[PDB]
């Protein structure tokens, strides 16, 4: 019995609305303020999701908060890509049921280039024929893909946990394939996909940080948790104190 | 802090 998968499927977060007023014009202020609220809302689900993951509670409470604070961007973008793929077939960015981005909004949000990259990520799910099980194991692995260069409180258990989630992904690939070249080819493709998430998350990190600094001048509201994490944790990533863990060099 | 309350 696939205990691990049972857990991942059982704890997968449901639908989250942004609360966007689709009646008012597509302004930068409105679009970004709603994206910020969506983030605040999804942050709640990411925390509950993570705490329910196999072995996560073995991490020191401070490390638990740390990995979530550093990896949320990538986690949310990856799940959004999956939603877009399965809903609008990756043709539009399905941030939330009430906040779907078309080309016009991509331009209005002033993050069109970033949206293009997210669309590409979304299309990869289709191009690679990623299964729901692969998606779930890969997403779980993204939580363990960014840490401080100086290490975590109990780095050793984080290392064991990360290793186990890699083992589970490899297992999911092999649990559906007999050929070694196929398994090896698939593992290569998926680790490459995971790596591609980081550059995108990085651009969004830089973008949201800059936006926070002058949010008062462009009329963009940042919720409490988002504001705290973006001014305290994000700068640690942008300054090089916290770095992603890539599979490939 | 809603964040700490989220873990607490
Ligand atoms: C993570 C979110 C919100 C959750 C999601 O579906 C992915 C999406 C990616 C862009 C983020 C957005 C949250 C708010 C941010 C960080 C804006 O400030 C600029 C980039 C936005």
Residue numbers in the entry:
A (entry chain A): 670 to 918
B (entry chain B): 99 to 106
What does the paper say about this structure?
To understand how the AR AF-2 accommodates tryptophan residues, structures of AR in complex with peptides containing tryptophan substitutions at the +1 or +5 position, or both, were determined. Nonetheless, each of the tryptophan peptides adopted similar helical conformations. WxxLF also makes backbone interactions with an alternate charge clamp residue, Glu893, pointing towards adaptability in AR AF-2 charge clamp formation. The benzyl moiety of the indole side chains superimpose with the corresponding benzyl side chains of the phenylalanine-rich motifs, effectively mimicking interactions of a phenylalanine residue. However, the presence of a hydrogen-bonding partner on the indole side chain enables an additional polar interaction not seen in the phenylalanine-rich motifs between the indole nitrogen and Gln738.
The androgen receptor (AR) is the cellular mediator of the actions of the hormone 5-α dihydrotestosterone (DHT). Androgen binding to AR leads to activation of genes involved in the development and maintenance of the male reproductive system and other tissues such as bone and muscle.
